[PDB]
Amino acid sequence: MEDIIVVENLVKKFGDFEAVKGVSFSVKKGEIFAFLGPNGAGKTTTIHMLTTLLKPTSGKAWVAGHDVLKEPREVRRKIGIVFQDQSLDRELTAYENMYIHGKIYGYGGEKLKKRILELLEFVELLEFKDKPVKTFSGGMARRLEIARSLIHEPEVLFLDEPTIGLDPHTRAHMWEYISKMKKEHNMTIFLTTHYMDEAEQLADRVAIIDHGKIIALGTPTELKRMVGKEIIYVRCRKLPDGRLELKIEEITYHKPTLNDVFLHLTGRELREEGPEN
Amino acid sequence: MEDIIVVENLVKKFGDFEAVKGVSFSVKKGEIFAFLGPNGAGKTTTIHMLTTLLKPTSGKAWVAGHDVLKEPREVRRKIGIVFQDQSLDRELTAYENMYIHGKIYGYGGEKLKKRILELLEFVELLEFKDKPVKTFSGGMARRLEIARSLIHEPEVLFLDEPTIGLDPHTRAHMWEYISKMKKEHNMTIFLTTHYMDEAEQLADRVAIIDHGKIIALGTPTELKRMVGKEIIYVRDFIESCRKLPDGRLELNVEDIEEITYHKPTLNDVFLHLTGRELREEGPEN
Ligand SMILES: Nc1ncnc2c1ncn2[C@@H]1O[C@H](COP(=O)(O)OP(=O)(O)O)[C@@H](O)[C@H]1O
Ligand SMILES: Nc1ncnc2c1ncn2[C@@H]1O[C@H](COP(=O)(O)OP(=O)(O)O)[C@@H](O)[C@H]1O
Ligand SMILES: [Cl-]
Ligand SMILES: [Cl-]
Numbered sequence: 001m002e003d004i005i006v007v008e009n010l011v012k013k014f015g016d017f018e019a020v021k022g023v024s025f026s027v028k029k030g031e032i033f034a035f036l037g038p039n040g041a042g043k044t045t046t047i048h049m050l051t052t053l054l055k056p057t058s059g060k061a062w063v064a065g066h067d068v069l070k071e072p073r074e075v076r077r078k079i080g081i082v083f084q085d086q087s088l089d090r091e092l093t094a095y096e097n098m099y100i101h102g103k104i105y106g107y108g109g110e111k112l113k114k115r116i117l118e119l120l121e122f123v124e125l126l127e128f129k130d131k132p133v134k135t136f137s138g139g140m141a142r143r144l145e146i147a148r149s150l151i152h153e154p155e156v157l158f159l160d161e162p163t164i165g166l167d168p169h170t171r172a173h174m175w176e177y178i179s180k181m182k183k184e185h186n187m188t189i190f191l192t193t194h195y196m197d198e199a200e201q202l203a204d205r206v207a208i209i210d211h212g213k214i215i216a217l218g219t220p221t222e223l224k225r226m227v228g229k230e231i232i233y234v235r236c237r238k239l240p241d242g243r244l245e246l247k248i249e250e251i252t253y254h255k256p257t258l259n260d261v262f263l264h265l266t267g268r269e270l271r272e273e274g275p276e277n
Numbered sequence: 278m279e280d281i282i283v284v285e286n287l288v289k290k291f292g293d294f295e296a297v298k299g300v301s302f303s304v305k306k307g308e309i310f311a312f313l314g315p316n317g318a319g320k321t322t323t324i325h326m327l328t329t330l331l332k333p334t335s336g337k338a339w340v341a342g343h344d345v346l347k348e349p350r351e352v353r354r355k356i357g358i359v360f361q362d363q364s365l366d367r368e369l370t371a372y373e374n375m376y377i378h379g380k381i382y383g384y385g386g387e388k389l390k391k392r393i394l395e396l397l398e399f400v401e402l403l404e405f406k407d408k409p410v411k412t413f414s415g416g417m418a419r420r421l422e423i424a425r426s427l428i429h430e431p432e433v434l435f436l437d438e439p440t441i442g443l444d445p446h447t448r449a450h451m452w453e454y455i456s457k458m459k460k461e462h463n464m465t466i467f468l469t470t471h472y473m474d475e476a477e478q479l480a481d482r483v484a485i486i487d488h489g490k491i492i493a494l495g496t497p498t499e500l501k502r503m504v505g506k507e508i509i510y511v512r513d514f515i516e517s518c519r520k521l522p523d524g525r526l527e528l529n530v531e532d533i534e535e536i537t538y539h540k541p542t543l544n545d546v547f548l549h550l551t552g553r554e555l556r557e558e559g560p561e562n
Contacts, residue, residue, distance in 0.1 A: 014412055040414075040444040135291060139317075164442070167317025168562055197558050254535040259558070268445075271558065273472045277445040 004029045004188050010059035012045050019045040021212040035192040036199040037209035043192035051158045064155045080149030080157040090134035105152040119147040139170035159191040194270045196258040227256045227264045241275040281306045281465045287336035289322050296322040298489040312469045313476040314486035320469035324437045341432045357426030357434040367411035382429040396424040416447035436468040473544040501541050504549045505529030510537040523560040
């Protein structure tokens with residue numbers, strides 16, 4: 001019921017270029033909220049502003065009862081950050097990297113040691129506790145960032161494209177951690193993604209973002225209601241690539257997905273490999 | 278037809294885990310050669326070994342007439358590296374970042390200044406030459422890494438997923454640079470990718486990689502010949518039929534829940550060979 005994220009006309013300009021054009025939304029406590037959009041939509045810029053790493057041009061943002069602009073240190077203490085810019089030390093082991101982060105936030109003793117091992121067990125890295133992070137996979141390093149961000153018991157976890165670059169097994173396990181954090185620990189998760197399957201499967205609500213704007217917002221089912229119950233693509237709404245969204249070149253038929261909602265709103269798709277290029 | 282890259286049973290183990298299981302191939306001079314495979318196939322591990330950034334567990338690799346394992350410094354001087362982890366300083370401008378890399382490799386004077394501006398014009402960043410890299414997008418920073426890797430005139434350019442995370446316009450421009458480097462400058466390009474269109478449109482030859490192994494190797498047309506001329510996915514007219522784990526039926530035909538019909542792509546070759554697709558969003562998950 002309580003709003004743990006409140007954003008009002010959040011804007012970011014890089015010189016004269018508008019990256020984020022005044023986005024607004026709210027996230028309830030214990031919710032998985034996803035920003036779904038393609039590369040270049042303003043997802044990383046938005047998540048950097050919500051986590052205090054980038055100053056907004058204008059607008060307002062409140063995270064966990066605190067003003068992001070006026071109380072960034074109080075906001076940093078209440079949130080977890082897992083971004084593509086890895087801040088792990090390759091020379092230190094997995095356990096050592098998390099002891100460093102734990103002592104920085106004020107934890108210590110046998111209790112900090114137990115917590116680290118528990119969080120390493122939760123992300124399935126307990127067997128690699130005494131192993132250098134230089135010899136770690138991308139998947140392993142991202143699983144270690146999830147465990148590290150949880151040491152200081154944040155209320156909200158911010159994930160910038162959590163499963164980009166990961167194999168299906170690590171990706172499936174990443175979704176289980178997120179799901180378990182929500183359901184078993186009342187955690188709030190704000191994530192950015194261009195994966196329609198990741199947004200449908202995990203998110204309670206989705207904000208579809210395109211060229212710095214929210215172009216649709218609601219539950220995956222409310223968004224899917226904007227398109228038919230059964231869609232056809234043949235090569236009524238004509239698309240730039242030539243096919244028609246309802247003895248030929250290409251015919252496709254399936255149940256609607258959030259990629260079909262993106263095609264319906266913008267005339268193109270979320271993926272890079274799609275016919276748009 | 279000189280082989281500028283020769284790889285023989287190149288292996289990489291991380292503890293007891295086998296990331297690359299003994300891969301072999303060769304790349305001709307002036308060729309675009311692509312490693313096509315899904316996330317976790319061993320593409321980044323292979324490209325890090327070929328560029329001297331990661332030591333192999335075993336095997337042999339020769340790049341531009343030099344042994345990768347015994348002459349890494351001579352190999353580094355002859356190749357260009359454009360990977361994910363950038364080395365660009367956000368405080369320095371685009372021109373300044375290029376001047377740093379140029380002076381490190383032994384260049385200087387008016388000639389280095391001209392070559393920087395040329396390379397910035399080639400990647401369409403000349404108008405942002407005196408602009409900080411902190412104020413650059415991802416596409417611009419990747420275009421700057423391409424220009425930076427070319428300062429020391431490498432014979433081979435190594436690209437680890439050149440267009441991942443880019444918009445279609447920057448992606449289309451990235452393909453144009455690669456094509457122009459091969460055709461207009463006799464450049465050899467080794468690239469890793471999980472995009473079936475990128476490998477088809479750019480590569481002369483493709484090595485399909487899956488779980489640390491090369492499972493198919495040839496031109497995109499030789500590989501497409503392994504599947505029908507027209508494929509159907511459904512969940513007398515059937516020439517061949519193959520059931521998939523997800524439940525669908527891969528049918529090869531001549532002239533319900535979900536039906537799809539299109540001409541074969543390298544993703545249909547990957548699904549024919551392995552029973553799963555290249556993308557993350559595919560039904561496999
Ligand atoms: N630091 C920056 N300086 C200038 N432009 C930027 C910067 N970061 C991103 N951009 C631009 O802002 C837009 C959104 O970028 P981004 O936040 O990275 O989106 P996404 O994460 O969804 O791919 C793009 O059109 C990109 O070119
Ligand atoms: N340093 C490492 N330590 C342990 N496992 C690793 C390491 N680097 C990569 N791996 C593993 O090797 C496999 C292949 O990795 P990678 O080369 O990055 O594949 P790709 O680039 O095609 O996605 C993956 O299963 C990955 O987890
Ligand atoms: Cl992707
Ligand atoms: Cl296999």
